[PDB]
Structure 1
Amino acid sequence: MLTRFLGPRYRQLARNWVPTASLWGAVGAVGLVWATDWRLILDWVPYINGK
């Protein structure tokens, strides 16, 4: 029941918190990449493919 949250202000405020939320997935994935040593991804990275 979320009709409440649809208006000009809400879209301004989402548009505000977008670059931040972008970077937070950058943080979260790259951390998971590093913590699991994801192989599949890390081959792409120069220096870090230590094989």
Structure 2
Amino acid sequence: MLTRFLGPRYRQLARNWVPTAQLWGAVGAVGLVWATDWRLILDWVPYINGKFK
């Protein structure tokens, strides 16, 4: 019965909020990465190679 949110306006709504939902996810990611010191993900970043090898 979630057919209430299915139409052109809602489709326009979703798009208007995508760059924002996408940028919020970049915030969440880097934020998770930097806070746990994600070895796997971090080692690829040019500077911040404070784990030598």
Alignment TM class, shorter chain as reference:
over 0.9
TM-score by length of 2: 0.90
What is the RMSD computed on CA atoms of the aligned residues?
1.0
Structure 1 gap ranges (5+): none
How far apart, in 1, do the equivalents of 2:16 and 2:26 lie? 18
In the comparison of the two structures, how many residue pairs are matched? 51
Higher helix proportion: 2
Structure 2: gaps (5+ residues)? none
TM-score of the superposition, structure 1-length normalised? Answer: 0.94
Identity %: 98
